Amino acid sequence: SQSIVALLFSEIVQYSQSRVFTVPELQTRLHDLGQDVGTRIIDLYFVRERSSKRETKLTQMLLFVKTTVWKNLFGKEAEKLEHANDDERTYYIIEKEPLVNTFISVPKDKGSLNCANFTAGIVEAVLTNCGFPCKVTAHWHKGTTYMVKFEDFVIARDKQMEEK
């Protein structure tokens, strides 16, 4: 079903709002929960979709996550995965479908960020357990996008591997 998950998740969000007295670390709680779910989402979806195969290439693993996590979680794989050439540590994954607004959400006057942050935390946990620790920020740029910021160590290991 959809109503059960959409609601029940909404009570996670608002009960955090109960235990939280402000916007930003409310969003931090949403991130932490996204992490705590992705921390197993990762290696569940590993076997059943990746055929139990590891992708050392950041591009390939990131693209495959983009397909898989969205295909099974919210059906539609995210529209586009892009790498910014100015900052190789910072890439983007734009998902025009808002997973927060699947359950049409609160006015963003009293607040800014939403379940977008929760799925961003999912992405961040997937990255950090795939051996690619990263910072994933939900951004209302061109609709819903997740900016991913790679550790200079991780992107450096990548660049060294990208020396064929």
């Binding site: 109503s3 959409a6 609601l7 909404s10 009570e11 969000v13 608002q14 709002q17 607004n101 359950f103 049409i104 959400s105 609160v106 006015p107």
Partner: protein, 219 residues
């Protein structure tokens, strides 16, 4: 054809959501002469007409702005009274601008508050037994469909007299109500609806119901 005002009220009955469709209230104009056939009877800051209806003018129809001077209460914006200009014949002929008093937000809130117990107490001791409250009201120019979800929510939408199948529209707004209340438990079950998502999806519903055909139930 359009659904004039889609509303909803809590158990207490406070109008939760004043979803107004685009409803062009009729504006009338006329360049009048020396003191008027129109009944320029003053009634509590509402300089309106009760008797002597001409040219599609109703009882509610109230002067808005002579020659584009909006009325504050009873006075001119420049500060003269309506009757102050009424006694003055030099400016005549002068252009009066009449509109029916458009129901503001608080007006509609009071209207729903005063209405609610009507439906709630609707012939509680009715001649037929085991009956319900008012399910459908039909009026001279509109028909109100009220649908209780067997407790709590009352979907109240007013459509055209000849319109048919409004119950399905109530079904769809029930669906979209659920699709909204998905998100905010801090949105109390009796807080007014303030969310643009419901607004835009209902604008899509209005665009649909511009077309009579409701199929795969149309949203």
């Amino acid at each position: 054809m359009i659904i004039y005002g889609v509303y909803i009220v809590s158990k207490s009955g406070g109008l939760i959501f004043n979803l107004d469709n685009n409803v062009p209230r009729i504006e009338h104009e006329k360049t009048f002469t020396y003191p008027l056939d129109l009944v320029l009877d003053y009634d509590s800051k509402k300089v309106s007409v009760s008797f002597n209806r001409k040219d599609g003018i109703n009882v509610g129809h109230v002067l808005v702005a002579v020659n584009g001077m909006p009325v504050n209460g009873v006075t001119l914006d420049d500060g003269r009274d309506v009757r102050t200009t009424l006694d003055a014949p030099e400016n005549y002929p002068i252009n009066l601008k009449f509109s029916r008093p458009k129901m503001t937000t608080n007006e509609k809130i009071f209207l729903a508050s005063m209405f609610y117990p009507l439906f709630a107490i609707a012939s509680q001791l009715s001649p037929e037994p085991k009956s319900s409250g008012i399910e459908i009201l039909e009026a001279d120019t509109f028909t109100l469909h009220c649908f209780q979800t067997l407790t709590g929510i009352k979907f109240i939408i007013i459509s055209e007299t000849g319109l048919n199948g409004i119950d399905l529209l109530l079904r769809k707004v029930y669906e979209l109500y659920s699709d909204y209340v998905l998100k905010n438990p801090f949105y109390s079950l009796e807080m007014p609806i303030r969310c643009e998502l419901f607004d835009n999806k209902l604008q899509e519903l209005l665009a649909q119901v511009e077309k009579t055909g409701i199929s795969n139930i149309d949203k």
